[PDB]
Design a protein around this ligand. Structure first.
Ligand SMILES: NS(=O)(=O)c1cc(C(=O)NCCO)c(NCc2ccccc2)cc1Cl
Ligand SMILES: NS(=O)(=O)c1cc(C(=O)NCCO)c(NCc2ccccc2)cc1Cl
Ligand SMILES: [Zn+2]
Ligand SMILES: [Zn+2]
Lengths: 262, 262
């Protein structure tokens, strides 16, 4: 992975090395009325094993493209047609002079950032790597993040950023209740078939984007936007980890189904 | 002309065969208040030789990507440092289920369609082809189009669409005053340096996007979206010419200059 979000190896070039990035069913997308349709079969998901013990600890890693927290496979979503077990969460964001780095947009507007909690079909596959090539192998929960009030739950992650500033660095984060990262009224969401938003852009993701955003503060966004580097600690051409979101994609005839009718 | 706006040869793959599509200064972009800056240097352009002889005919083609009208080199913009002479106009649009296919956006919003009147620097270069990959080579006037009242002047072009239904087909349009296609208060515009929005995406275009949109009727917009195919007539797999706009590109640490402040 030397793909980036900026310059010659940025997103308009990813398809040169990752053919699925130029394929169908790409994410993210702009959620707007013309392509929305209510589906009453979109019943509420249940979040099981999301309340991670505070006496356990979970690995936080800078992977050169985002900051990721590994999650245990006992954490799962109930309500899809298979069990989906968590593998990791991570974020996408903008930069200090333009804090508008969500991946999905709503009626053309970016949010400040976006959280993805990646799960894989553990009823069918031994791990997320294997699932990532298969029909609906992954399911991602996406939370839109807007600049607002300080959020103590997101700070359980952000308080460790200065320990994972460079590519390959790892830290441990005590467990906390991951459901605290989700917004109000999780029963209201958008659902569509899409892809990884990063290389290798496999069109194998069932996306759930919650309708309501959460808030984190300006100071928490500024920490997220200034603490991290895409490059290793000893790299003589450092690159700040900023603006790590993909532009929205054409719809390719897809609709987005909504669990809310208004 | 192998490139398309859908499937494997769509916009994320243009950079394989057109490397500038993954380079700097790419268009189109979202025009939004954060990145706007009034520049009193931006005085009104003058449109000279736009009242085309009604005794002359201008070639309308379907080139498999848009509908284009050839323009004569006595038509030019005055007001820029060099004289920019017209070569052609063409349009970009969406489709009837999502009729929001402008290239530029304003505060994240697409307009229904967009007209580009392409000019080249004839003081420095002998033709548009030669100018297209050269410094200061091109200048485009962009008009945003929304749905509203019937527009007789756009119908001077739209009435001919049925004769250029398929790729390779051509029709003759009697001269008319191309300035009738411009919006109100053409003194009010956005200006920035960018690129062709189609392959080869050379970063050689000085963009002028007028502030105010024009209106065409619902029937005219439906005709533009439904009249044309990308494919030759005898193609056993026809492809409708719809959604022929490029997604907005990242545009960071840059300004769009405006001729208006209020
Ligand atoms: N943004 S996203 O669409 O939510 C997404 C991102 C990653 C990811 O780790 N990208 C690497 C850069 O941060 C991912 N990785 C899980 C995975 C993918 C392939 C192989 C192994 C693990 C799965 C997904 Cl769905
Ligand atoms: N969308 S746009 O950015 O306004 C633009 C489009 C074309 C164009 O013809 N694209 C082909 C698909 O229709 C162009 N052609 C210029 C050109 C290139 C080579 C030879 C002659 C003319 C110049 C520009 Cl600025
Ligand atoms: Zn992600
Ligand atoms: Zn154009």
């Amino acid at each position: 992975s030397k793909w980036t979000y900026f310059g010659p190896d940025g997103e308009n070039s990813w398809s040169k090395k990752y053919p699925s990035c130029g394929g169908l069913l790409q994410s993210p997308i702009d959620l707007h009325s013309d392509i929305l349709q209510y589906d009453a079969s979109l019943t509420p998901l249940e979040f099981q094993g999301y309340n991670l013990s505070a006496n356990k600890q979970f690995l936080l890693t800078n992977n050169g493209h985002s900051v990721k927290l590994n999650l245990p496979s006992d954490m799962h979503i109930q309500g899809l047609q298979s069990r989906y077990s968590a593998t990791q969460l991570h974020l996408h964001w903008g930069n200090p002079n333009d804090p508008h780095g969500s991946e999905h947009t709503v009626s053309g507007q970016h949010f400040a950032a976006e959280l993805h909690i990646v799960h894989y079909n553990s009823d069918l596959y031994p791990d997320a790597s294997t699932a990532s090539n298969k029909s609906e192998g992954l399911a991602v929960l996406a939370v839109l993040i807007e600049m607002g009030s300080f959020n103590p739950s997101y700070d359980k992650i952000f308080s460790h950023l200065q320990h994972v500033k460079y590519k390959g660095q790892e830290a441990f984060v005590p467990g906390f209740n991951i459901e605290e990262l989700l917004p109000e009224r999780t029963a209201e969401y958008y659902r569509y078939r899409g892809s990884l938003t990063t290389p290798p852009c496999n069109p194998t993701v069932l996306w759930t984007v919650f309708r309501n955003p959460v808030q984190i503060s300006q100071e928490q966004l500024l920490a997220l936007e200034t603490a991290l580097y895409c490059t290793h600690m000893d790299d003589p051409s450092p690159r700040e980890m900023i603006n790590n979101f993909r532009q929205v994609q054409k719809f390719d005839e897809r609709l987005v189904y909504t669990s809310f009718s208004q």
